[PDB]
Nucleic acid binder design. Structure first.
Lengths: 62, 98, 82, 95, 82, 98, 97
DNA sequence: ATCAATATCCACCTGCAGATTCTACCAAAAGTGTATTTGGAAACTGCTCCATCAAAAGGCATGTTCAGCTGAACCAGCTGAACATGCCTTTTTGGAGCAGTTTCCAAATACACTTTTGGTAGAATCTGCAGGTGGATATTGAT
DNA sequence: ATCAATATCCACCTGCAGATTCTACCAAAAGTGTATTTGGAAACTGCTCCATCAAAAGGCATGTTCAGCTGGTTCAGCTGAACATGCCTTTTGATGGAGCAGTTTCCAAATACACTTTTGGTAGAATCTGCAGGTGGATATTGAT
């Protein structure tokens, strides 16, 4: 279910491992269950630490 | 000539590789390293190709996780530059004594 | 000329991995440390894999051998059978 | 010719039950199969240890339930437990 | 008057433990954090202990229940049987 | 009046408690905490005394180990004072997410 | 008349203790720790051997499985010396029929 | 620099923890039988090694740029220790459950027969996906 | 500090390879139906250890006060990265072929299971003793004006 939700989010009709990894890591309970599990071809979450991103001095107010 | 500031391209690369899942290490040198190491334990061993792919998957996931912990240690130390001591700390805390 | 082949895990590949790890800036000395870390990790896995291999009286390392080696190190891998 | 069993057909039926208009890669199906195998072994092993701890030679649904409560967190465990209970009662009913 | 009883894990006891941990200097805010950490840790252990307890149809929590709860959390304890 | 500098007595206390093994938490408040928490799951439960001693042993060993990792993080951060963020980092790295 | 019977490895540890250091005792708590240790490593080894056997579709657990399990679980020289001793023991057993 | 507190050394005297004898009684081995299992021989096809050749994407040295690391200085507030004392921890009877026994009974295995459905070979469609337009969002270097 | 210029990302078809779905056949896996059995629920007993809070001794927790000392902060210099580009190199891939090695499979003895008997080792009670702990004192360690 969650993987199909991620697929629709990506406008995809076929479930891929990416969606399974996204699903797992985006679910607190599954993340706990599979915290020490490696999903082949899963990649990682788009998680960037707030302090490494460029400043509010970004040059485009508008 | 047009010139981007330091960090912009790094961030773009982060976003690119974090959006994708393809393997970032070259297949052949990895096979050669594996074969050399295994050779040091037992001679004339063979490997299934998918076994090598599995080893690569494990290795890369392990390395990104270590670099993540390293990054948190650096940030904790008010830095943005990772250092050996950060890796050593992260590995020590996981108990990867070695 | 080759250099013990550990050098094929090149700096830019490590850079890419660190970027996936979210790293923005990297000391030059990190790379060799990472290589050393990888060798230790790898050695243990492969060592166990070969042990499983040896138990089966086989001369070909299978994916399952890797999977079991990884499991016993608490590094379960999904996607390759079993 | 040899014979390799998998859970593929059941996953595919379930996928059609939850999302009729959606496919799945073979690699993903393999991941689901790996998952299933892992949880199967985890549960059976824990049930085995409990039975051993209680000097019990039988594995019942009680041990399964208990193992689940130990392994799964909060609502996931509660819903799974409720489903298992409902299933056993349905099995026991329709003899 | 009592204060939910978590306060009985007093500051000086935590100080002593930190000293055994080799800590020389301690922020004042550490203590409550430690208490919270302990509660989480404890909850999980006791939760599992009671689950084992419930399985045995017993109303008395045994040491073995604790041991099993600890083992499944990867925190094996030696010295209390089993 | 005679006066010792800050740290000398702390170090003496470290040496003392690291030389010994006796439990540092009071038995009764620990029993009361345990009983309260367990009560919140199931009513009128009892506990064996050695079960409580076991729980105390586990708890204290866990806490010293966390404080050790915390101390390493502090030293890594060029500090000698432990902070919540150090504990949070150590627990995050072990995966004690909570 | 009622009575039960609790087994332990205590006497064997004490015999070994007397073999290596004749003038030394051991507390009951420490002996309990040693018994816990023995039970833990026993369970670890049998479980691992069992898994290998299942992986290889083998219904028999042999000295090879013990050895392999040891090689997986124990490190370097500790493993080598334990392995040598085990081999020595099986060889002594097999001849002493 | 030493002397005031700290911890180490030494002495000695008990008791209780632990080392040691005396049972019996549980299981650990000796001896038939049998039933499974491993290893060995011979076919045998899948696959992994190997090399060799033609792109192809990326590695890699070189140098220009400037922002991150790190050191000097310093302030200030926060944390550490003595001292006083309060107070809460430790020390000093029954009965709620915890283990042992019988027993007898629901439920789980074992065996034979029959069905079903999931592996597996082979045919066919639909969408992921490379690529060709079109405009917008994300960055700098003048605004 | 962000607006007029750059220029990566998106939007959206669009064919099309090739994943993926569907279709058919086998036999191995599940299920029905009968006999036996044995594990465990439930009564029911003996005990053992654990809830109960009362009050005193004493020693550890709380809190005050003060000092000091270190963690927060700013400034500034340097150096160790970041990053463009040229251009070399060392992957990729296809593709093709030799040989090896996983796999099957067929068969006889090896190995271990399983049932029955005689030991004899070990658990446990009961006894004895000797070393760890208390408790005090003398003495080498170690730290502030």
């Amino acid at each position: 279910e969650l993987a199909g939700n991620a697929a629709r989010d990506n406008k995809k009709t076929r479930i891929i491992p990416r969606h399974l990894q996204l699903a797992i890591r985006n679910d607190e309970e599954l993340n706990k269950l599979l915290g020490r599990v490696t999903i082949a071809q899963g990649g990682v979450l788009p998680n960037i630490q707030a302090v490494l991103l460029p400043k509010k001095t970004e040059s485009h107010h508008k | 000539p047009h010139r981007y500031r330091p960090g912009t391209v790094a961030l773009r690369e982060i976003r690119r590789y974090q959006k994708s899942t393809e393997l970032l290490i070259r297949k052949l040198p990895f096979q050669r390293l594996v074969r050399e190491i295994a050779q040091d334990f037992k001679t004339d061993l063979r490997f299934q190709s998918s076994a090598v792919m599995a080893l690569q998957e494990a290795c890369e996931a392990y390395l990104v996780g270590l670099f993540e912990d390293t990054n948190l240690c650096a940030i904790h130390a008010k830095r943005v530059t990772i250092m050996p001591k950060d890796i050593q700390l992260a590995r020590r805390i996981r108990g990867e004594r070695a | 000329v080759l250099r013990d082949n550990i050098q094929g895990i090149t700096k830019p590949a490590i850079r890419r991995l660190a970027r996936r790890g979210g790293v923005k800036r990297i000391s030059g000395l990190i790379y060799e440390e990472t290589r050393g870390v990888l060798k230790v990790f790898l050695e243990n896995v492969i060592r166990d894999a070969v042990t499983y291999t040896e138990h089966a009286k086989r001369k070909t390392v299978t994916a399952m051998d890797v999977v079991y080696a990884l499991k016993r190190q608490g590094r379960t891998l999904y996607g390759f059978g079993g | 010719r040899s014979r390799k069993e998998s859970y593929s057909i059941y996953v595919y039926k379930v996928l059609k039950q939850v999302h009729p208009d959606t496919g799945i890669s073979s690699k993903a199906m393999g991941i689901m199969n790996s998952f299933v195998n892992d949880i199967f072994e985890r549960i059976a092993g824990e049930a085995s240890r409990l039975a051993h701890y209680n000097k019990r030679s039988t594995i019942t649904s009680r041990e399964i339930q208990t193992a689940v409560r130990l392994l799964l967190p909060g609502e996931l465990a509660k819903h799974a437990v409720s489903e298992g209970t409902k299933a056993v009662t349905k099995y026991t009913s329709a003899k």
